[PDB]
Design a protein around this ligand. Sequence first.
Ligand SMILES: [Zn+2]
Lengths: 256, 255
Amino acid sequence: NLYFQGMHYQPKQDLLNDRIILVTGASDGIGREAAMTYARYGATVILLGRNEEKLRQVASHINEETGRQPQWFILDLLTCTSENCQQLAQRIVVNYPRLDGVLHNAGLLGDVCPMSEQNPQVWQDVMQINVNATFMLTQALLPLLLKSDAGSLVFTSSSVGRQGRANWGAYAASKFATEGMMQVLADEYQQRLRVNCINPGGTRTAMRASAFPTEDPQKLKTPADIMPLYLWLMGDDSRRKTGMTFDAQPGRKPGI
Amino acid sequence: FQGMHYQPKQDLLNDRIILVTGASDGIGREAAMTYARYGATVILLGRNEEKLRQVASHINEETGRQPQWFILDLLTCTSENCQQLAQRIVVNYPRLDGVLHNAGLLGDVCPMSEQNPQVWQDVMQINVNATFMLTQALLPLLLKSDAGSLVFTSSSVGRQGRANWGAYAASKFATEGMMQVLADEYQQRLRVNCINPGGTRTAMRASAFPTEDPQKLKTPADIMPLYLWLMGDDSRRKTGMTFDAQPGRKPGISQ
Ligand SMILES: [Zn+2]
């Protein structure tokens, strides 16, 4: 997972020209940063999220920066059905000829507390968003991704998706499930799609702060700082990489 | 010699109280019978009253004691139901020395592009969510044991995802993760581990591999040594680990 270490990745500024990339959870944090970064490197970006107010602002900011205004679509992973996912895919089909990338960034942390105290309803929400709806949206978007010359599908993992640790409860279970889903898809789509996970590591975001209220967030890298791996997985330089889980901060030791 | 090479003493499990889920059929049935044969007081859990009674009657015929059974449907059980169940046992038993989570749903064996999303949800609900809720309800009883042993059922596809195993794979990855979190939280208080039984002669297995000759597979009886090892005192220092009952079998369909 430390593969990307010492990569010092600085791609051409048009790395993603003519790539159409959908980013979920795009309203703030890592998802907003990824959408803006991909657009700055030339991509046609599609924003997905649940907050119309924030999505409008991200689209406007991207338009100010690139002269091209991305479309946004509302999809709330916690409540959507399979039919809702297929209906979102049909909207994309009408507007875009393919998807060259899908970055699944949407997710829910839920409770950080011992197993004996985990709330079963929160557990089920974490599983619903991180695993089930992420699966359902993937399934709906597979035909679009297969129209790419080399489609790239990326899930969000975590160090606790590789080794479970005390108090990480549903989040850990859901990120192990994500690594599993990713491996099944990579196997089914060998030589057709790239399918991988990214573990962003500790990053300056509201989710991180909720899990570690004592941590000084100024000691963490920002979403901007961890973008090189996100760019690499969408551009041509990662073309024959699939079935892998990569750390965005290979240098960093997990924990506070 | 350990794990699958284990050669147990008779009465290894004397005075151990062990709850087995999915006890009506296949491996759960064999594990319940085997634990009682090596001296355990077994509690059977499943959704089918008739079949559980039948397993209990067989154990009675073999050992002279009648195990009790309780009904729980993991597909539809709420957290309340799990707590009610723990209440019911708590009226009759002072502790649990082991819990073997063997209940599970395989779901669709088909490409991710075809996986039925209602089945997928059901597989996660049984294998992950309700398995968690039942674990939560039973933890205090396990802590009352001198050295409680909590065992989840995993699969080769819980360690390496493979084409067409969709929801089952995701759910067994989640099971390994849940086992690791639980082992970490209960270090020096519980042992928490997974068993990967490998392919064994069961109805589930034949449904996923209709061309396979089941006579080329081990039976549930054949893979019991590891199941005994994890409940007996010989595994007391072992936690956080996943063990294969059939370390020398190639995963997937038999040749
Ligand atoms: Zn931007």
